[PDB]
Amino acid sequence: LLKANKDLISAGLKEFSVLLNQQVFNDPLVSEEDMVTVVEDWMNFYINYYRQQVTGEPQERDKALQELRQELNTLANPFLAKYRDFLKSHEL
């Protein structure tokens, strides 16, 4: 209900999707642990962000927060892989 709610989600969606796909690949390169922290921060930051940026009944808010948590959890899986493979491509 209300395009406003779905709009906020889509914003976090396009933001994350574009962010993962628009990351910058330049040396020096960031490590996996550093990327993980950044990803986690992005995930908790967005999660808390959306829990407070909702309207209407509390039930809808929760569905947005739950779907988001699963949304990032899935969306992050492929990103970490791209960087994982990007890390392996190194030499040593």
The span from the CA of 36 to the CA of 3, in Å, is 32
Structural domains counted in the chain: 1
Which domain range does residue 84 map to?
A: 1-92
Distance CA 53, CA 47 (A): 10
Cβ proximity of 50 and 65 under 8 Å: yes
Instruction: Please tell me the experimental approach by which this structure was elucidated.
Output: NMR
CA distance 25 to 46: 23
d(CA 21, CA 33): 19
- Work out the angle at residue 43's Cα, subtended by the Cα atoms of residues 77 and 7, and round it to the nearest 5 degrees: 100
- Amino acid identity, residue 80? L
* CB neighbour list of residue 23: distance below 8 Å, 6 or more residues apart: 79, 83
Report CA-CA distances (Å) from 35 to 32, 42, 49.
5, 10, 20
Asked whether the bond before 28 is cis by omega within 30 degrees of 0, the reply is: yes
* C-alpha pair distances (Å), 8 with each of 2, 42, 90: 11, 16, 38
List the CATH number of the domain containing 69. 1.20.58.420
